Write a protein that binds this ligand. Structure first.
Ligand SMILES: [Cl-]
Ligand SMILES: [Cl-]
Ligand SMILES: [Cl-]
Ligand SMILES: [Cl-]
Ligand SMILES: [Cl-]
Ligand code: NA
Length: 129
């Protein structure tokens, strides 16, 4: 599914991401934008053999099982495929574990390089939330 911007902001808010670990909604929307372009089916293979999955490009090295990342963990206790669903619940629940792990949203390199310190509220501007 390719979400609309305000559509995704609404689903993220419903699932409790607005101000989760102190990160305003626009942070999460901006991160999604630059990670996946709002496409729940996004995948990206990394050089290390791990893969990033879904709207927030969650990585198989730590967070989900794809059966093909030697030495990896599955800290969200999910098949990585669950992160490609049109329903964002698995992505959001797993995001919440990640962002709690000590580095906040810096865990998402694109958030650090493209969102951090920008006017992230622009990402939720106009949305009926
Ligand atoms: Cl915001
Ligand atoms: Cl594996
Ligand atoms: Cl959803
Ligand atoms: Cl939680
Ligand atoms: Cl933080
Ligand atoms: Na894994």
């Amino acid at each position: 599914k390719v979400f609309g911007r305000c559509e995704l902001a609404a689903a993220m808010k419903r699932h409790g991401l607005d101000n989760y670990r102190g990160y305003s909604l626009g942070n999460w929307v901006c991160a999604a934008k630059f990670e996946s372009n709002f496409n729940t089916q996004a995948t990206n293979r990394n050089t290390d053999g791990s893969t990033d999955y879904g709207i927030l490009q969650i990585n198989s090295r730590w967070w989900c099982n794809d059966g093909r990342t030697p030495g990896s963990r599955n800290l969200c206790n999910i098949p990585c495929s669950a992160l490609l669903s049109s329903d964002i619940t698995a992505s959001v629940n797993c995001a919440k574990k990640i962002v709690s792990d000590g580095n906040g949203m810096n865990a998402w390199v694109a958030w650090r390089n493209r969102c951090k310190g920008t006017d992230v509220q622009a990402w939720i501007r106009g949305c009926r939330l």
